[PDB]
Ligand binder design. Structure first.
Ligand SMILES: CCOc1cc2c(cc1-c1cc(/C=C/C(=O)O)ccc1O)C(C)(C)CCC2(C)C
Ligand SMILES: CCOc1cc2c(cc1-c1cc(/C=C/C(=O)O)ccc1O)C(C)(C)CCC2(C)C
Lengths: 10, 211, 211, 10
């Protein structure tokens, strides 16, 4: 789940 | 600790029809991640569990939000894109019945009890902190956060509405309707995906992918 | 007025696997009507609305009951016929996942908080008195009865468990899981009916007929 | 819904 991980990290 | 002022701040920080509805939902998914970050202690959870909670709860979280946003609308809802969907339009798209459920079980009930933004915020945080979500590394920590939100909600209700002792229970008793409505909206969404004639953008599409 | 002693009295008054499960459910439908009659003020409702409430709520009402009945069972449930269904049997019938949901979200949570028969009774009465049920002639009267059950439940909890202030909320927060589990069990039931290789007796069959 | 009506009446 690439988008969710990306937005939560940064 | 779980201050309702921080929860409220989180809410205030983020402030055919089917195609428009899908556009709106995808747009709000980005905004939802920002809201979750502003809820006390959420960001302190492991990243994996933050992922699980948002994948499990996003639909109910977004339905709660647009329902409350639509309290001033007559026989319709206001989407995040600024577009309105009314009963006639929903019916004409073949989704009349589920649309009517939203209006009667969520929008009108929120309107009639005058649910405020703090109460909506806390209901959403309760939904966010769902200890039943599969694969959580520490369900107990999530459950502990939920418990702190509702202890805080209860105290807020009893302070702000001292002559409505059933108010707190009434808020929580909207959650089964929200669960039910969320499941049916998701069922429709999978069908829209199956048919393949409705644009579904990337964040919404990601939410539909299989665990 | 809504005394928890009357609600408790109502509970105490009525005290492959798929075929057995269907048999059990049909058998309990008869017993459910008797329980509903013993809940204060239910029988005073118009007959039409008593019908609507029981048609809308029967599945959740019966799931709540067998879940609480199964607290002393290890990795399984006790049916009203006296038969047990375990995880292995449910999995071997192709219904493993929904069966696991029942155990984890209902049976174990009931076991862990030691939900008592008064609390179960009141949760069921809250489910029975559902003001969202379609076609009710007086939703307000039903809603008023629900309100009286939860005011009574709350006072009972705070008296019997004074050092668990979150107990009342915890009970009500099992209701979304019960809603969700009820919908999925009903979905399976309609499929069993569609295939036509599972005996479905008359009261259960009647509950499946279209409004 | 014949059975339900019957059981509720009597
Ligand atoms: C993304 C599609 O999810 C839906 C579907 C619907 C509907 C709503 C949503 C939906 C919309 C949003 C939009 C939120 C917003 O604009 O803030 C979020 C989650 C959702 O499940 C309503 C209730 C409007 C009408 C019925 C259908 C099934 C078409
Ligand atoms: C009447 C069938 O409803 C079901 C179905 C299931 C299941 C249970 C019920 C069911 C049983 C009862 C039996 C109650 C009782 O024996 O007291 C009542 C309502 C119900 O929905 C479990 C959770 C055991 C396993 C999965 C399936 C889908 C097979």
């Amino acid at each position: 789940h690439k988008i969710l991980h990306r937005l939560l990290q940064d | 600790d779980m201050p309702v002022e921080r929860i409220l701040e989180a809410e205030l920080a983020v402030e055919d029809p089917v195609t428009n509805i899908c556009q709106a939902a995808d747009k709000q998914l980005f905004t939802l991640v920002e809201w979750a970050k502003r809820i006390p202690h959420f960001s302190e959870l492991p990243l994996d569990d933050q992922v699980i909670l948002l994948r499990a709860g996003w639909n109910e979280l977004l339905i709660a939000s647009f329902s409350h946003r639509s309290i001033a609308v007559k026989d319709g809802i206001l989407l995040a894109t600024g577009l309105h969907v009314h009963r006639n339009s929903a019916h004409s798209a073949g989704v009349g019945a589920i649309f009517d459920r939203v209006l009667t079980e969520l929008v009108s009930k929120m309107r009639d009890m005058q649910m405020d933004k703090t109460e909506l915020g806390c209901l959403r945080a309760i939904v966010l902190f769902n200890p039943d979500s599969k694969g959580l590394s520490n369900p107990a920590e999530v459950e502990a956060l939920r418990e702190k939100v509702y202890a805080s909600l209860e105290a807020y209700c009893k302070h702000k509405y001292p002559e409505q002792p059933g108010r707190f229970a009434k808020l929580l008793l909207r959650l089964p309707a929200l669960r039910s409505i969320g499941l049916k909206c998701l069922e429709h969404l999978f069908f829209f995906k199956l048919i393949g004639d409705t644009p579904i953008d990337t964040f919404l599409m990601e939410m539909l992918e299989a665990p």
